[PDB]
Amino acid sequence: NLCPFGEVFNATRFASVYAWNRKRISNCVADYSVLYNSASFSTFKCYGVSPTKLNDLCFTNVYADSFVIRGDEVRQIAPGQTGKIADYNYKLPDDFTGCVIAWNSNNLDSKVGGNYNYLYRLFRKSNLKPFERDISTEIYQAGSTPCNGVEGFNCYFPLQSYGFQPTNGVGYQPYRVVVLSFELLHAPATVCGP
Amino acid sequence: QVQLVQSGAEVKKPGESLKISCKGSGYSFTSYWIGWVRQMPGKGLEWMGIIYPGDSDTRYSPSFQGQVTISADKSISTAYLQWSSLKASDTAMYYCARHPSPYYYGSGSYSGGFDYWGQGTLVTVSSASTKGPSVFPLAPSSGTAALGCLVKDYFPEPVTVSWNSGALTSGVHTFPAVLQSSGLYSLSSVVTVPSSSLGTQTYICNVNHKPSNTKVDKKVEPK
Amino acid sequence: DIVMTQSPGTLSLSPGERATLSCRASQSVSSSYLAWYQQKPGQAPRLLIYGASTRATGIPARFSGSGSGTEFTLTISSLQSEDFAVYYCQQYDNWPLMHTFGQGTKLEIKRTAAAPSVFIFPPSDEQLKSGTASVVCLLNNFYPREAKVQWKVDNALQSGNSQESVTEQDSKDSTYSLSSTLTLSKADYEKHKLYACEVTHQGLSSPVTKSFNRGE
Ligand SMILES: *[C@@H]1O[C@H](CO)[C@@H](O)[C@H](O)[C@H]1NC(C)=O
């Protein structure tokens, strides 16, 4: 049986990046040239793996993360990157082994009247650790005065709304992004190719 | 399978340095925090510190800050705990344990707490030196009689005691050793048995002290 | 910053009953970042609850965690033999900076009273050769644990010279055994003749004494 990549790539809903979704891929064969031979991806770069040599290789655990970010934030979805997304929403380890896939989704994630359901974490007291998913809503203290869990000046709700109006610039338009993680452990392989 | 393994038991002299290790396998070692927990003999758990091996982000308890050093080597998936000058009060069991952050989502769901633990590293810090045990009989006299052997004056710990090469198991009670003020350990292994077997069964306690390679068998007869 | 206080310290129960274990915090663990562990003798702790109310994978449903703010509770509804151990609560509210355990709560199997079969032992000459005399008093297979062991040497109270060691609850019959070792020098062993061990226990109608005379 073939790996259910369509469940995440062809999903109707995607998650906000702060609450990014994770789907583990196991006990199946995965044809990656099917994905590599699609012209419908703005970005698809791989790290620590050759995308061509991926159909003849096995891995212990394969994960598929999916979320929505701006076009100009797709650069942040890479090992060692810096910024609001990479540091506060979705961080990849330095030794990341996998592929980052993204495509424009302005047609689906920005309708007449915009779309303010996609959120991202604008503030955090410290950077995320890799593969951490912070969904807390503690009021962030931006200035000197303490907040005490109430919103006010310099005391912000940590999650901020993406604009995502239909006639935004290409870099402020929503992009759907799937990250494939190829973890290799001294353990049985659960995902291979032909 | 997730597994944390700790290094073997340590017997040291005050002032000596010590490094103990904790090696994880079956998971991305750099993605989970590793905490160190102390359990002094007959006491509760105390948090010492925690480290994220991905970047060696290290956090100590204020009761152990500067007392000890916590580090990690990603290339061998190992966390360390080390003292520069051990002290007698450091005699304790030291657990390393994996702790996923409340935000970690690497499995597809959230977790918490020290979910996996090592088997612990026993650390004994004493002025005493390695010494084999001294075995004396606890003889019966005057329809159930009790007999045994007094295993006294030995260091470091443990000692194993069997009866009749492991054939006499029913009714045996090998007591927990106590720390003599001499910095030296001592226990007794007793066994209740029919008084009519005193003249019809030979009773030998088999004492073994692996640190001193001392293996002795003592016969136990009516006084 | 936060102190964790568990209650009670030790509790004795039979199987089938319900155990309600409390864990107090000096400040509010407003994140509900609190965990419960179980530790059995000679074993590493085991995670039972995290997030104050979520059971770890494999933990049976009889273990239930509850609470918020400053009081947290671990409820074990239908106690089984393997449940009687020590339980700890952990707070990790200010992640990752501070963790704090409670002092622990010990669960103790209830059982019918069992009287201690007392035995006394004198030194074995071969020990007396080396100039030291150990005087062993054995209490075997008794319940409950509380037992009052006093040493008479020529019928005078002894203080500060005897060590007593207790075993764990037996896996089969749940009783305790106790050894009490008086240690004296050889000179101090021969300035006296009557060595007595008096044992007081719930399961005994009157205090039992096992004594002997030196060289007899
Ligand atoms: C999603 O559906 C489209 C149909 O328009 C198909 O071309 C594509 O291969 C599907 N994605 C998968 C199977 O990953």
Residue numbers in the entry:
A (entry chain A): 334 to 527
B (entry chain H): 1 to 142, 148 to 228
C (entry chain L): 1 to 216
Wording from the paper:
A comprehensive search of patient-derived phage display libraries combined with high-throughput biochemical and functional screening resulted in the discovery of highly potent neutralizing antibodies, with diverse epitopes and distinct mechanisms of action. To understand and characterize the molecular basis of viral inhibition, we determined the crystal structure of the potent ACE2 blocking ION_360 bound to RBD and of the complementary non-receptor competitive ION_300 in complex with RBD.
To determine the mechanism of viral neutralization of the non-ACE2 blocking antibody ION_300, the structure of the ION_300-SARS-CoV-2 RBD complex was solved by protein crystallography to 2.35 Å. The structure of the complex reveals that ION_300 binds away from the receptor binding motif recognized by ACE2 on the RBD and against the exposed ß-pleated sheet, particularly impacting on residues K462-S469 immediately following the ß1’ strand. Our structure revealed that the ION_300 interface with the RBD is predominantly through the VH domain, burying 647 Å2 of antibody surface, compared to only 27 Å2 for the VK domain. All three CDR loops from the VH domain contribute at least three residues to the interface, whereas only two residues from the VK domain are involved, with a total of 19 residues across both domains losing at least 10 Å2 of solvent accessibility following binding. The contact surface involves seven aromatic residues from ION_300 CDR loops, three of which are central to CDRH3 interactions (Tyr103, Tyr104, Tyr105), as well as seven hydrogen bonds and two salt bridges. Furthermore, in reported cryo-EM structures of the SARS-CoV-2 spike protein, the ION_300 epitope on the RBD is buried behind the NTD of an adjacent S1 polypeptide chain when the RBD is in the closed conformation. The ION_300 binding site only becomes accessible when the RBD is in the open conformation, indicating that binding of this antibody may result in a spike protein which is locked in an RBD open type conformation. Identification of contact residues within the epitope predicts that this antibody is likely to retain binding and neutralization potency to the RBD mutations that enhance the infectivity of the widely circulating “Kent”, “South African” and “Brazil” variants (B.1.1.7, B.1.351 and B.1.1.28 respectively). Taken together, non-ACE2 blocking RBD neutralizers such as ION_300 may have a greater potential for being developed as broadly neutralizing antibodies to mutant SARS-CoV-2 strains than the antibodies targeting RBM epitopes.
